[PDB]
Amino acid sequence: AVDFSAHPWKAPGPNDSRGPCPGLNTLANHGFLPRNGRNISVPMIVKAGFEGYNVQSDILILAGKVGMLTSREADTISLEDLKLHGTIEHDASLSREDVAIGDNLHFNEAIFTTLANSNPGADVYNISSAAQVQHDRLADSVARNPNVTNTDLTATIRSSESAFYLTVMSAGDPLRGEAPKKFVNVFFQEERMPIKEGWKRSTTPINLPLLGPIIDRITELSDWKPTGDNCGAIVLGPGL
Amino acid sequence: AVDFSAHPWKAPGPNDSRGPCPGLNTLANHGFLPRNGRNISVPMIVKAGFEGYNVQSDILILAGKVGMLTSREADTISLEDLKLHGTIEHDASLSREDVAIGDNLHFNEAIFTTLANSNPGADVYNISSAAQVQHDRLADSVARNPNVTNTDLTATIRSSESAFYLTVMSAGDPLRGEAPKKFVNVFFQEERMPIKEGWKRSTTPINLPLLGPIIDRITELSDWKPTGDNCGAIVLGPGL
Ligand code: HEM
Ligand code: HEM
Ligand SMILES: *[C@@H]1O[C@H](CO)[C@@H](O)[C@H](O)[C@H]1NC(C)=O
Ligand SMILES: *[C@@H]1O[C@H](CO)[C@@H](O)[C@H](O)[C@H]1NC(C)=O
Ligand SMILES: *[C@@H]1O[C@H](CO)[C@@H](O)[C@H](O)[C@H]1NC(C)=O
Ligand SMILES: *[C@@H]1O[C@H](CO)[C@@H](O)[C@H](O)[C@H]1NC(C)=O
Ligand SMILES: *[C@@H]1O[C@H](CO)[C@@H](O)[C@H](O)[C@H]1NC(C)=O
Ligand SMILES: [Mg+2]
Ligand SMILES: [Mg+2]
């Protein structure tokens, strides 16, 4: 029984490491991960994701070990390391700019406008709105970034990230693939768990069987096509 | 420093986990890594490679974290996990068969014949012989394997592996890029440190600055050329 009162939100300090991921940033901001954002292992991510969000080890082990590639350390990262373009970090993010034409690390309100204005007339974001947002963000990158990378891999990662905001920030049934806008907006804009606002950790485990169909449905509805070579190669370490 | 007398060679039993890598298998056979070949983390690899071979953390962290992708565990592998084709394990190996046409895991004497007969007339293997062997092994895979994969990435990994046998099994000066055949043959054929034969751990650290030029020279002298998509995508986990 995690006591969320024992995990208060605190804004990061000047020497706290933060990355392009609102999920991990939010866990650090509540002390489920180290508040300094440093020396974070995959076991630590597994535990934090379980405690904070009820996200299970299947997805966190897979994504965590890919994330470990971004650091120079044997078995840890700093959250900022995860900005390394072409490992996980990709163009056509929901709340960050493309690395070739801007800042791929920090929350950007102008970029976030697209998500914030989605699913007009409803009080939730859902699978169809998530797909529309992905379509529109990719169109923006294609229009403004001549170095855009858009592949089967990046498209799948992008749908995974949309599935995450729809499930982790849901009103309590992640299967629904819908989340209150008031929760998701706090998650992105403040990297805070919207506890005041009425959010509670899912009592349903969020695992790959739960996320998989949501991911695939978002992709299907997004009118997606690859760009260029469609090469699914990742960057294997920093510096290279 | 390191007590090699506390690290005797013992042949693996039928249940001991062993992989396609003679470097890690040899460390396990001397107990620098667990003799059962299981529950191995990147920190353990870093320590074992330092103690056994004077290989430094830079290369072992980079390679080790890519190797961790081959298991389902948060921060460990079994050595056999590393056989996963298309993460690190590749066609045109020095001592193993290609997975599409044979056994990509165990030492194979028929395959090893090419390396064993290289640098005729000399008592060492060196950079030019290593390059010739790589050329010949790739030609063999191209001739006989209808699913052969040959990319910039696999070529670089193959040259890295050649650089490893030339440096770790050297007669004490790894910069020379040459190793006694009597040492290298024991390393491959027995996965044993050739201590009775007169081998000693390098007193010179083996790191990426040392290996990089050897790797690049081997590639250069092998007359390597791209043969197709040349898409350097790795497999990011088992079962995918
Ligand atoms: C295994 C652990 C994790 C790793 C290594 C990781 C890594 C990343 C990285 C590198 C990005 C930036 C990609 C980009 O937009 O360019 C990202 C984005 C994202 N992550 Fe995570 N993540 C993890 C876990 C989670 C969790 C548990 C959530 C839960 C809500 C989450 C939600 C998101 C979202 C919504 C984005 C999109 C941000 C945007 O498009 O602006 N992640 N993640
Ligand atoms: C960082 C840790 C290591 C990992 C994860 C690793 C992984 C691997 C893998 C998966 C292979 C098989 C590739 C193939 O031939 O298809 C391989 C081959 C090889 N490794 Fe390692 N290795 C590591 C460290 C070392 C060390 C310290 C040496 C020292 C001599 C070494 C020497 C070799 C050699 C010579 C081969 C070629 C075998 C052949 O072509 O038949 N490795 N390694
Ligand atoms: C943690 O990460 C830093 C790099 O940010 C590294 O220098 C340090 O050795 C790591 N280890 C600790 C403090 O356990
Ligand atoms: C998303 O919500 C909108 C507005 O209520 C609705 O028209 C649409 O059908 C919903 N889509 C899904 C997948 O529920
Ligand atoms: C695996 O290694 C961990 C960490 O060192 C240890 O706690 C555990 O007992 C090991 N398990 C086995 C099966 O040896
Ligand atoms: C390798 O050894 C052979 C035989 O002694 C020699 O001809 C060749 O020049 C050597 N190559 C290098 C790079 O030393
Ligand atoms: C191997 O290549 C043949 C064509 O020569 C193809 O029919 C077969 O599907 C390939 N197998 C794999 C594992 O891709
Ligand atoms: Mg991005
Ligand atoms: Mg192989």
Numbering used by the authors:
A (entry chain A), B (entry chain B): -3 to 236
List sentences from the manuscript.
Here, we introduce a close ortholog of MroUPO, a UPO gene from Marasmius wettsteinii (MweUPO-1), that has a similar reaction profile to MroUPO and for which we have set up a directed evolution platform based on tandem-yeast expression. As a member of the heme-thiolate-containing peroxidase superfamily, UPO activity is fueled simply by H2O2, which plays a dual role of oxygen donor and final electron acceptor. In general terms, long UPOs are monomeric proteins with a molecular weight of ∼44 kDa and with a strong preference toward small aromatic compounds due to their narrower and “carafe-shaped” heme channel (e.g., AaeUPO vide infra). By contrast, short UPOs are either dimeric or monomeric proteins with a molecular size of ∼26 kDa per monomer, harboring a wide open and symmetric cone-shaped channel (frustum) that dictates their preference for bulky substrates like steroids and long aliphatic compounds (a preference attributed to MroUPO, see below). Here we present a new dimeric short UPO that can be heterologously expressed at high levels in both S. cerevisiae and P. pastoris, an enzyme that shares its substrate profile, selectivity, and biochemical and overall structural characteristics with MroUPO.
High-quality large plate crystals were grown in 10–20% (v/v) PEG 4000/0.2 M (NH4)2SO4, and the crystals diffracted to a maximum resolution of 1.58 Å. The crystals belong to the P43212 space group, with two molecules per asymmetric unit. The electron density maps allowed the whole polypeptide chain to be modeled, from Ser1 to Leu236. The model contains the characteristic heme-thiolate prosthetic domain, the structural Mg2+ ion, and any remaining GlcNAc units attached to the Asn35, Asn122, and Asn143 N-glycosylation sites. The asymmetric unit of the MweUPO-1 crystal structure consists of two identical polypeptide chains that are arranged in a homodimer. The monomer is mostly helical, and it is comprised of 11 α-helices and two short β-strands. These monomers are covalently linked through an intermolecular disulfide bridge between Cys227 of both polypeptides, and many hydrophobic contacts are formed among the Val62, Leu65, Ile230, and Leu232 residues in each chain. Interestingly, there is a clear density where a second water molecule establishes a polar link to this distal water molecule, putatively mimicking the early ferric-peroxo complex (“pre-compound 0”) formed in the first step of the postulated catalytic cycle of UPOs. The heme access cavity is a 17 Å long, deep funnel with a wide irregularly shaped entrance that reduces to a narrow base close to the heme group. Another interesting feature of the MweUPO-1 heme channel is the absolute lack of ordered water molecules, even in the ligand-free crystals.
